[PDB]
Paper text:
A. oris (previously Actinomyces naeslundii genospecies 2) can express two different types of pili: type-1 and type-2. Type-1 pili mediate the first attachment to host salivary proline-rich proteins (PRPs) that coat the tooth, whereas type-2 pili mediate attachment to carbohydrate structures on oral streptococci and host cells. FimP is an elongated protein, approximately 105 Å long and 35 Å wide, folded into three IgG-like domains: the N-terminal (N), middle (M) and C-terminal (C) domains. In FimP, the lysine of the pilin motif (WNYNVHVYPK) is exposed on the hinge that connects the N- and M-domains, and is thereby available for the sortase mediated pili polymerization reaction.
A construct comprising residues 31–491 of FimP (FimP31–491) from A. oris strain T14V was expressed in E. coli, purified and crystallized. The refined model comprises residues 35–490. The M-domain is stabilized by a bond between Lys-190 and Asn-319, linking two strands that run anti-parallel to each other. The C-domain also contains one isopeptide bond, formed between Lys-363 and Asp-487. There is no isopeptide bond observed in the N-domain but when superimposing the C-domain with the N-domain it is obvious that the N-domain also has all the necessary amino acids, Lys-52, Asn-183 and Glu-145, to form an isopeptide linkage. In agreement with that, we observe that the FimP shaft protein is stabilized by two disulfide bonds, one in the N-domain and one in the C-domain, the domains that share the CnaB fold. Four metal ions are found in the FimP31–491 structure and they are modeled as calcium due to the high concentration of calcium in the crystallization conditions. The fourth metal seems to have a structural role and is coordinated by a long loop in the C-domain, protruding from the S6 sheet.
Author numbering: 35 to 56, 64 to 490
Amino acid sequence: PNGSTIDPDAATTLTVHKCEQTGTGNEDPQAECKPVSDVEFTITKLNVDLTTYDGWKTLADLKGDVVKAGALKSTTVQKITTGANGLASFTDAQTEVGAYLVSETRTPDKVIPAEDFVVTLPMTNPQDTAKWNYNVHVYPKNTLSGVDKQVTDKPAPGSGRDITYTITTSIPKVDYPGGARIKRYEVVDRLDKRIKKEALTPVVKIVGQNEVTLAETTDYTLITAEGKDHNWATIQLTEEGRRKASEARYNGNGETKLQVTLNAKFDAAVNLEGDLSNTAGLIPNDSPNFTWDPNNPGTTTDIPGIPTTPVLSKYGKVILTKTGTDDLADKTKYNGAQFQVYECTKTASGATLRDSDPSTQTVDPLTIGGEKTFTTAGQGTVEINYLRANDYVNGAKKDQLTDEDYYCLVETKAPEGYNLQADPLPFRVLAEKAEKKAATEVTVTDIPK
Ligand SMILES: [Ca+2]
Ligand SMILES: [Ca+2]
Ligand SMILES: [Ca+2]
Ligand SMILES: [Ca+2]
């Protein structure tokens, strides 16, 4: 057959590449693609004859409207489910010369669906416009740009202080002016049981170009529940909240998102040693595979819906040992020394203490586990429980550290027979110790009188 015109009896294939993150028709060997298995694609042949100019003209007239293409659907349908390599490889047995509507028709809960799209077999090869390409490769786009969770714990160096979580989730684009509405939209947070689930004081916004704040009851309701190994908080948009979201996204773009702020609170003496992990998930539609019931998590442990990566806060124990240049074997002589703790900047002359509460003129020490003063006892020791790692803050490792990234002990009362210190004493709590619940061991040496 002639190479320049369409061969009605040509063998064809259609290969859909399903990737976690996201069109020439040619295979693109990298092409960064983390393949996604177990996703079903359905192709439906359209009622256009691509062996005729009129068939191509019908497609052109759609001006890329995929919903209008749906009006051309035949009853000729084929399906394939991706394997480990994320490919849905429709064969020559499954495809013929013509146009197809391609839709992702089964999607594991955690996976973002592809957008529907139309493909032709063959395509004119843009890399060689003298060729008809009968073996088409397509890399579909995600319908949602992402879901993300952040933590702000820079304000919480001492354990038990407030931590803020911010969850930001894509909103599906639906045909708002046509009457289409998101039918279900829930943001679920899997809460560590150390957080007070009854005191989250949520704030919900639609962010992007021009942000708005949504109203509880009117636009959403917060539903919390006890769980097995965690507790649970769901922000569930109401009919009006869903309407606002549907509209905002339609008039906006992919970066028009819901933003949920949760204000996590603790008992002051909370045992935060180690990692405090938080994860959220998005349920973006009313598909029956999302069986989450915000009021009945039952024994669920995995986050429902499309998950964020977890975010961590890391708090460590400090064990302070008090001694002296006299090195007495009777360690009880080093009891009764008192200390307070600050964030500080190490300097050539010691350290500059940072005021823990800038609202007042007095330079205040940190409140750590509800306490400000730590007194040696026993064998001249005291535990300071617990301090957030200096090198892990706001949900990320601080790759580079500076002299600003310190805590300081200040000796506020010397043990009997000893001097106070000349300077504050800088130290760090490192994530490598805190995340393993390993103590940070600091020795303070006193000068005898
Ligand atoms: Ca065929
Ligand atoms: Ca499910
Ligand atoms: Ca000094
Ligand atoms: Ca102050």
